[PDB]
Design a protein around this motif. Structure first.
Motif, PDB file in Angstrom:
ATOM      1  N   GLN A  91      -0.773 -10.450   8.573  1.00 38.40           N
ATOM      2  CA  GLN A  91      -2.103 -10.793   9.069  1.00 38.40           C
ATOM      3  C   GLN A  91      -2.051 -11.743  10.220  1.00 38.40           C
ATOM      4  OE1 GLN A  91      -5.615 -10.815   6.417  1.00 38.40           O
ATOM      5  NE2 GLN A  91      -4.210 -10.627   4.740  1.00 38.40           N
ATOM      6  N   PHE A 104     -11.744 -20.815  -3.907  1.00 35.58           N
ATOM      7  CA  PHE A 104     -10.345 -20.698  -3.567  1.00 35.58           C
ATOM      8  C   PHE A 104      -9.561 -21.871  -4.142  1.00 35.58           C
ATOM      9  CE2 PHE A 104     -12.123 -18.031  -0.053  1.00 35.58           C
ATOM     10  CZ  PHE A 104     -11.555 -16.861  -0.491  1.00 35.58           C
ATOM     11  N   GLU A 114     -10.449 -13.477  -7.471  1.00 35.98           N
ATOM     12  CA  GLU A 114     -11.364 -12.416  -7.603  1.00 35.98           C
ATOM     13  C   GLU A 114     -10.660 -11.076  -7.917  1.00 35.98           C
ATOM     14  OE1 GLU A 114     -10.170 -13.807  -4.926  1.00 35.98           O
ATOM     15  OE2 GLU A 114     -10.515 -12.703  -3.112  1.00 35.98           O
ATOM     16  N   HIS A 160      -2.139 -17.471  -2.022  1.00 41.87           N
ATOM     17  CA  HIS A 160      -1.278 -16.918  -3.067  1.00 41.87           C
ATOM     18  C   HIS A 160      -1.777 -17.135  -4.466  1.00 41.87           C
ATOM     19  CE1 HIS A 160       1.466 -16.801   0.252  1.00 41.87           C
ATOM     20  NE2 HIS A 160       2.366 -16.182  -0.490  1.00 41.87           N
ATOM     21  N   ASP A 180      -4.955  -6.610  -3.262  1.00 44.04           N
ATOM     22  CA  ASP A 180      -5.930  -6.279  -2.204  1.00 44.04           C
ATOM     23  C   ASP A 180      -5.306  -5.325  -1.168  1.00 44.04           C
ATOM     24  OD1 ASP A 180      -7.527  -8.235  -3.547  1.00 44.04           O
ATOM     25  OD2 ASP A 180      -7.613  -9.552  -1.807  1.00 44.04           O
ATOM     26  N   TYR A 181      -4.029  -5.501  -0.881  1.00 39.93           N
ATOM     27  CA  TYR A 181      -3.347  -4.637   0.115  1.00 39.93           C
ATOM     28  C   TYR A 181      -3.253  -3.137  -0.367  1.00 39.93           C
ATOM     29  CZ  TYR A 181      -1.653  -8.462   3.194  1.00 39.93           C
ATOM     30  OH  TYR A 181      -1.535  -9.441   4.115  1.00 39.93           O
ATOM     31  N   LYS A 233      -9.794  -5.403   2.498  1.00 42.39           N
ATOM     32  CA  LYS A 233     -10.234  -6.475   1.586  1.00 42.39           C
ATOM     33  C   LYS A 233      -9.474  -7.800   1.800  1.00 42.39           C
ATOM     34  CE  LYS A 233     -10.513  -7.173  -3.462  1.00 42.39           C
ATOM     35  NZ  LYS A 233     -11.633  -8.121  -3.350  1.00 42.39           N
ATOM     36  N   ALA A 234      -8.199  -7.672   2.008  1.00 43.08           N
ATOM     37  CA  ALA A 234      -7.353  -8.842   2.132  1.00 43.08           C
ATOM     38  C   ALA A 234      -7.672  -9.629   3.397  1.00 43.08           C
ATOM     39  CB  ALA A 234      -5.894  -8.449   2.093  1.00 43.08           C
ATOM     40  N   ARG A 269     -10.773 -11.575   2.802  1.00 46.50           N
ATOM     41  CA  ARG A 269     -10.392 -12.738   2.031  1.00 46.50           C
ATOM     42  C   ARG A 269     -10.048 -13.865   2.968  1.00 46.50           C
ATOM     43  NH1 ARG A 269      -6.468 -15.365  -2.000  1.00 46.50           N
ATOM     44  NH2 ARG A 269      -7.776 -15.559  -3.800  1.00 46.50           N
ATOM     45  N   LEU A 270      -9.295 -13.550   4.012  1.00 45.93           N
ATOM     46  CA  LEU A 270      -8.925 -14.532   4.984  1.00 45.93           C
ATOM     47  C   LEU A 270     -10.087 -14.994   5.827  1.00 45.93           C
ATOM     48  CD1 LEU A 270      -5.331 -14.013   6.417  1.00 45.93           C
ATOM     49  CD2 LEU A 270      -6.112 -15.519   4.670  1.00 45.93           C
ATOM     50  N   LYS A 311      -5.321  -1.845  -3.009  1.00 46.44           N
ATOM     51  CA  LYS A 311      -6.474  -1.498  -3.859  1.00 46.44           C
ATOM     52  C   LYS A 311      -6.910  -0.025  -3.714  1.00 46.44           C
ATOM     53  CE  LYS A 311     -11.281  -3.113  -4.435  1.00 46.44           C
ATOM     54  NZ  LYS A 311     -11.336  -2.698  -5.846  1.00 46.44           N
ATOM     55  N   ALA A 312      -6.897   0.432  -2.500  1.00 47.07           N
ATOM     56  CA  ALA A 312      -7.372   1.771  -2.213  1.00 47.07           C
ATOM     57  C   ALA A 312      -6.459   2.828  -2.821  1.00 47.07           C
ATOM     58  CB  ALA A 312      -7.518   1.974  -0.722  1.00 47.07           C
ATOM     59  N   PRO A 326      -0.574 -14.524   3.586  1.00 48.06           N
ATOM     60  CA  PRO A 326      -0.470 -13.090   3.502  1.00 48.06           C
ATOM     61  C   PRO A 326       0.209 -12.467   4.775  1.00 48.06           C
ATOM     62  CG  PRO A 326      -2.784 -13.861   3.286  1.00 48.06           C
ATOM     63  CD  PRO A 326      -1.936 -14.959   3.879  1.00 48.06           C
ATOM     64  N   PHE A 369      -7.880  -2.435   8.384  1.00 51.06           N
ATOM     65  CA  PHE A 369      -7.304  -3.697   8.124  1.00 51.06           C
ATOM     66  C   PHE A 369      -6.990  -4.409   9.445  1.00 51.06           C
ATOM     67  CE2 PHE A 369      -3.816  -5.528   5.032  1.00 51.06           C
ATOM     68  CZ  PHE A 369      -4.303  -6.811   5.177  1.00 51.06           C
ATOM     69  N   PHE A 428       0.811  -1.155   0.000  1.00 51.08           N
ATOM     70  CA  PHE A 428       0.000   0.000   0.000  1.00 51.08           C
ATOM     71  C   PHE A 428       0.880   1.255   0.000  1.00 51.08           C
ATOM     72  CE2 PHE A 428      -4.117   1.545   2.397  1.00 51.08           C
ATOM     73  CZ  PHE A 428      -4.379   2.487   1.424  1.00 51.08           C
ATOM     74  N   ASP A 484     -11.872  -1.417   0.857  1.00 49.91           N
ATOM     75  CA  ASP A 484     -10.613  -1.619   0.113  1.00 49.91           C
ATOM     76  C   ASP A 484      -9.423  -1.748   1.082  1.00 49.91           C
ATOM     77  OD1 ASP A 484     -12.285  -1.150  -2.159  1.00 49.91           O
ATOM     78  OD2 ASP A 484     -11.180   0.631  -2.771  1.00 49.91           O
ATOM     79  N   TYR A 485      -9.453  -1.006   2.174  1.00 47.78           N
ATOM     80  CA  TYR A 485      -8.343  -1.055   3.159  1.00 47.78           C
ATOM     81  C   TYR A 485      -8.237  -2.463   3.862  1.00 47.78           C
ATOM     82  CZ  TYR A 485      -7.272   4.027   3.138  1.00 47.78           C
ATOM     83  OH  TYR A 485      -6.821   5.266   2.846  1.00 47.78           O
ATOM     84  N   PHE A 524      -2.042  -9.954  -3.744  1.00 45.94           N
ATOM     85  CA  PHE A 524      -1.812  -8.896  -2.753  1.00 45.94           C
ATOM     86  C   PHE A 524      -2.104  -7.479  -3.291  1.00 45.94           C
ATOM     87  CE2 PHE A 524       1.166 -12.255  -0.987  1.00 45.94           C
ATOM     88  CZ  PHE A 524       0.132 -12.871  -0.257  1.00 45.94           C
TER      89      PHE A 524
END
Ligand SMILES: Cc1ncc(C[n+]2csc(CCOP(=O)(O)OP(=O)(O)O)c2C)c(N)n1
Ligand SMILES: Cc1ncc(C[n+]2csc(CCOP(=O)(O)OP(=O)(O)O)c2C)c(N)n1
Ligand SMILES: [Mg+2]
Ligand SMILES: [Mg+2]
Lengths: 662, 662
Positions: free
Chosen positions: B121, A636, A477, A473, A439-440, B442-443, B446-447, A442-443, B118, B412, A412, B439-440, A437
């Motif tokens: 996390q 997944f 989506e 990994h 997703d990390y 999202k990851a 996912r988990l 995206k913003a 990831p 997050f 990010f 978005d912050y 990643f």
């Protein structure tokens, strides 16, 4: 050094801000009222800008309001500074089509250097700006030619500093010793929900020194001279970025000052009047006292004109003594690329096989020699994304000319820094990590898109083909994720030649971010001419192999699944089924084409379609249609060898062929 | 305290790990070889677990490997500890269907407490686990009944600590004074791309003390006793979470040890042999020396059985003296909810009008009284998401029983903590922020989905209707974002009654996260019975208003746009056009229904369809079909008053009606 005209200036900011909000019946008055003193000291003694030239002076100091909710203060400042923000504009805060929107919008407002609604990103982007200043300073400055030499300022609040991305950016800034970066921290003990003592009691000063920042405390944040001395000290410490904590009272003047209640709502007619009493302010609404426009005229505007005029002269000399260097400096700022990208880029023969991460790596090395403004890096994944710029150095305090950025495991923070680097101007940036990643970050892509920055994201390991590393990994989506963000282009190249083409289009696209989605595994070269692939990628989608005569149907695929579709076209011929095979490397680029052109690639009358992509089917019904079939992955993945994952999740010729035939 | 059998144990871990990787020809040997000493000291002297009962003992210590790439070490440990991970399993590392996947997968492997591929996390989730221990400890422990009392351990690397989310979690942990959380930091000076001195030179110790952690340095990370003393000190400091930095040599034993080259690739037959020489290890591949299984049997397994047996007895007593309390404790762990959620939840009459954030807030207060295990909070947005649990306290060191969590501006970190809290067991968690800022986090969603955790996300301000805050605060693409993540359910309630129903379904769904997407603005109550809305939301989609007789067409809408569709159905009647109006609050829930049921809501033979949602059209062609029309928003929004934004971006009856009629 500071007097009562200066304090009237402070309270001009306070009052413009609060009245703007009141009249809008919407906005955030606490921060303007708390932070006007810091912003006033900065803008009148320490911000080398020339509003007379809007945002065209490349060597101006960069100011970012990270705490974007203080927008009214920013407009207020902009107004008094001489930017094209008029009193009427202030009176149209938060109104349809105003140039004074609820949060600051780059491109909307003269003088707004970044779009900063989302917290943590503003300061993270300034880190970017400061990185680019340092990099270009080192590239281009010469003895007697400080052609790139300016400060970067971010004004942050408690919010910015709780966000992880700001931690990434400070860590990194600290490490890179960005001595020209100064953060001003409106430390008021308040956040939106209440006191920071309910969530945020850390020792910020210490955290920042642990990053390698200089920390300075301004106990009385309304003392102008003390804020001034602090900035002077920040600048004197050129070996370290500096954070100045400036203790402040949120909403100063409100009955509710020092509480969260003044964070986010208009004060109300009586709160306004009350704050005006405290300020002993008897001017009418939306009024600048003459002495205040005079003080801004002298401290800020006159000094800006003279700094730019001096810079312009020095720059005329620089151009005389270092013609070729000055030319590159201007090409950096104006995005010039050679006409020969098409020949500069590597090209792959029908018999080659390469992973698109590795085609990407070869595009990067080829381009880096020819496009001097390019640089970039990876979030600790250069050696796996394949984004090492061979021979071109490492960006580090002792070698700011180095072109490989080592962002660390800071996706990010990296994206935000890219955004800043692009906002700064002068270079072309790229950054890489694993697609999963994204997703990390995206913003930040979102902000790339909103701010219209041609940031280049290089996101590898694009699918379940990753294999043994397993579901965490393996993207599913993330194509959906990125494709749906407005104003982006997402390319998923199907081979080497598509990868070079997409890099070309990435460099030629200047008004939106370009995201390159790349494979771990090797892909065969598509059995058609480089010229056809280049034209087809430029268009976003094109036919790879037509039907001999009349088409039974059409397979529409992206990336690594284009090769599958070609294999199934063969297998299906052998059953009297002649299908068109389309590559659609960018939906967005494709949909930007003429109806006429689109219909030639995907005939509207052809109903027997199949879409094939290693990721969710969500979205594909658009192209597959009522009667189509959607080959994709809506679960997944798994830790297994690559070919096994692909087979089990149905990325196979057998499964494609079988699906077509039912 | 430590002897040569112990060192043989260390090198058993090293060798199992490296051989597993070698045989897989895939994996990460550096960390197992560097961190075996710390993991061995922890598992044999400091981890109160009982592998005999798998992961059923609620009061076991929780271990998380955040640096998930050290998976082989974890399996190695698991094996020797007595978990259901067999030597054959180790021999099937990274193989299709093995229980020993490339990164650790919760639910896949006996003894794996979290899915941690990831980075950042894993530790952030442990913060969660530690928060829940503290919260339940305070709720349920009594004099002589330490019913919830255990440590939480995370093993982290340089990667985890560069990620912003880990900073959020440490900040928060520090503030909450989680004295039972201990982080073990494999500090080896190496990351994937090379030396940490190229990206990450911060002072970690100092950063952590600034958070309010205790910092301890283990200079010689291969000294077992020193690691042991350190953990003892960590536990003694129960007022602060503790981080122990343990200086280590990555890949110790390889010719390449202390370089990035041993990070991520098998060592190769000769590197293995070399490391075995250094270890003076002459056992054959995949062999545990008897003395080592004996030492694990005694230090770990026997002690675990006896700790659980003692806990079980104490818990029989606890149940005798505090029957009602013990019952709630078991209901927490087993997810019991009353049969009366339907009557507990608020209900709204045909004439009411409420914003779904505000219906959500009323569901939360109603539920909190009846579902004692529920708690949650907001990322500094409780007062704007409307997620304050009235009267139920604040979660803080002095009041761990409090049920409102103040996560701060840490989206997050919050999501990760939720995940941990859920993995821990014993409660139902919810957390909130603005939909645009999903978005912050999202990851982490996912988990949630991968780990099958029924975390509840409450995401408000769901659309451009937000209005004056502008494009950065107006979601467009975030429904796509979240809907495409496998194993989630996303509800966008169209009114109060839908909002209560979705909360009900959220509580009854236990195998996937439930995401509630809610409005800032008020929405009219749908003109039909509460019973019909409840059944319809349970099904994910349903008809709100049928056609009098034969349907000209169908409008399919979600959330706030269901009310628009009802208004356009009226307006369209007046032109001889009788349309069905469907609410589709959850696509995923809808698609999980029978073909038969789905066809009753959206008739396959009805081709004149229109889809209406305030966000991208991407995805909607699925429901709109070849001949349908897609009413949505494929651009960023604007700062303007709410009704103006909606009108300008085509969320209006006029535009819907006009589109239908062309
Ligand atoms: C990423 C992100 N999360 C949440 C918000 C909503 N928000 C705006 S300001 C703020 C809290 C920060 O309070 P602070 O920065 O201390 O500002 P003050 O109230 O001090 O002006 C929040 C949560 C946001 N704008 N961006
Ligand atoms: C979020 C995220 N970004 C990137 C990666 C890829 N990755 C795995 S480990 C690692 C670097 C960390 O090196 P370190 O944690 O110091 O491990 P060592 O090499 O020290 O074992 C990276 C970038 C990841 N797993 N997760
Ligand atoms: Mg504050
Ligand atoms: Mg390391």
């Amino acid at each position: 050094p500071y007097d009562q005209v200066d304090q009237l200036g402070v309270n001009t900011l306070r009052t413009l801000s609060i009245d703007a909000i009141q009249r809008a019946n919407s906005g955030h008055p606490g921060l303007p009222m708390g932070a006007a003193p810091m912003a006033y000291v900065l803008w009148t003694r320490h911000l080398k800008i020339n509003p007379k030239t809007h945002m065209n002076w490349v060597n101006r100091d960069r100011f970012v309001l990270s705490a974007g909710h203080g927008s009214a203060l920013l407009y207020s400042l902009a107004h008094l500074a001489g930017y094209d923000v008029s009193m009427d504009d202030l009176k149209n805060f938060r109104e349809w089509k105003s140039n004074t929107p609820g949060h600051p919008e780059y491109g909307c407002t003269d003088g707004v250097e970044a779009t900063t609604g989302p917290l943590g990103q503003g300061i993270s982007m300034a880190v970017g700006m400061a990185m680019a200043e340092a990099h270009l300073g080192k590239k281009f400055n010469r003895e007697g030619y400080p052609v790139m030499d300016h400060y970067t300022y971010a004004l942050i609040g408690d919010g910015d500093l709780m966000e992880g991305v700001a931690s990434e950016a400070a860590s990194l800034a600290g490490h890179l010793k960005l001595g020209k970066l100064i953060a001003l921290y409106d430390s008021n003990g308040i956040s939106l929900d209440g006191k920071t003592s309910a969530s945020f009691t850390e020792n910020v000063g210490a955290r920042f020194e642990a990053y390698g920042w200089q920390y300075i405390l301004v106990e009385d944040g309304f003392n102008l001279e003390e804020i001034d001395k602090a900035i002077v000290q920040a600048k004197a410490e050129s070996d370290k970025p500096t954070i100045i904590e400036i203790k402040t009272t949120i909403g100063y003047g409100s009955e509710n000052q020092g509480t969260h209640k003044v964070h986010g709502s208009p004060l109300g007619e009586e709160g306004v009047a009350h704050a005006k009493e405290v300020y002993n302010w008897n001017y009418p609404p939306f009024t600048v006292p003459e002495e205040v426009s005079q003080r801004f005229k002298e401290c800020l505007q006159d000094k800006g004109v003279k700094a730019e005029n001096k810079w312009n002269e020095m720059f005329e000399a620089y151009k005389k003594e270092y013609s070729d260097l000055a030319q590159k400096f201007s090409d950096g700022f104006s995005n010039k690329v050679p006409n020969t990208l098409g020949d500069i880029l590597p090209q792959y023969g029908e018999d080659d096989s390469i992973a698109t991460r590795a085609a990407s790596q070869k595009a990067i090395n080829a381009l880096a020699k020819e496009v001097s403004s390019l640089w970039g890096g990876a979030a600790d994944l250069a050696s796996s994304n394949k984004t090492v710029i061979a021979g071109e150095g490492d960006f580090q305090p002792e070698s700011y000319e180095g072109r490989n950025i080592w962002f660390g495991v800071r996706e990010f923070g990296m994206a935000c820094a890219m955004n800043g680097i692009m906002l700064h101007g002068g270079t072309r940036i790229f950054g890489s990590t694993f697609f999963v990643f994204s997703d990390y970050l995206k913003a930040a892509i979102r902000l790339s898109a909103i701010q219209k920055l041609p940031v280049i994201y290089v996101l590898t390991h694009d699918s379940v083909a990753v294999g043994k590393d397993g579901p965490t990994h393996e993207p599913i989506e993330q194509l959906a994720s990125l494709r749906t963000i407005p104003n982006v282009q997402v390319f998923r190249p199907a081979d080497g030649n598509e990868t070079s083409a997409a890099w070309k289009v990435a460099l030629e696209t200047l008004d939106k971010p370009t995201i390159l989605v790349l494979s771990r595994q090797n892909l065969d070269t598509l059995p058609i001419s480089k010229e056809k692939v280049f034209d087809g990628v430029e268009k976003g989608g094109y036919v790879v192999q037509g039907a001999e005569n009349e088409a039974d149907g059409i397979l529409i695929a992206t990336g690594s699944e284009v090769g599958l579709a070609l294999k199934a076209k063969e297998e299906l011929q052998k059953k009297g089924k002649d299908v068109i095979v389309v590559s659609l490397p960018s939906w967005e680029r494709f949909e930007a084409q003429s109806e006429e052109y689109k219909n030639t690639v995907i005939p509207p009358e052809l109903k027997k379609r199949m879409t094939i992509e290693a990721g969710t089917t969500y979205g594909w019904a658009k192209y597959a249609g009522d009667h189509g079939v959607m080959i994709g992955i809506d679960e997944f993945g798994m830790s297994a060898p690559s070919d096994i994952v692909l087979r089990e999740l149905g990325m196979s010729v057998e499964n494609i062929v079988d699906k077509y035939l039912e």
